[PDB]
Amino acid sequence: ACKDYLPKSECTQFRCRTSMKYKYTNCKKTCGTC
């Protein structure tokens, strides 16, 4: 269902603040979604 999208450099905490897409689609586990 959810797995790593790419290295930690592409997904950051900034995404969990304004980027809804990253939280669910671009960041499967990194943004603390899965």
* CA dihedral (34, 21, 19, 9) positive or negative: positive
Please provide the size of the chain in residues. 34
Using CA atoms, how far apart are residues 11 and 21, in angstroms rounded to an integer?
11
Using CA atoms, how far apart are residues 34 and 17, in angstroms rounded to an integer?
17
Contact 32, 16 (CB under 8 A): yes
Q: Cα-atom radius of gyration of the chain, to the nearest Å?
A: 8
Using CA atoms, how far apart are residues 32 and 2, in angstroms rounded to an integer?
11
Provide the residue ranges of all domains of the chain, joining segments of one domain with +. 1-34
Question: Could you tell me how many helices (H) and strands (E) the chain has, helices first?
Answer: 2, 0
Q: Token digits for 21?
A: 């897409």
- Provide the Cα torsion 16, 24, 32, 27; round to 10°: -80
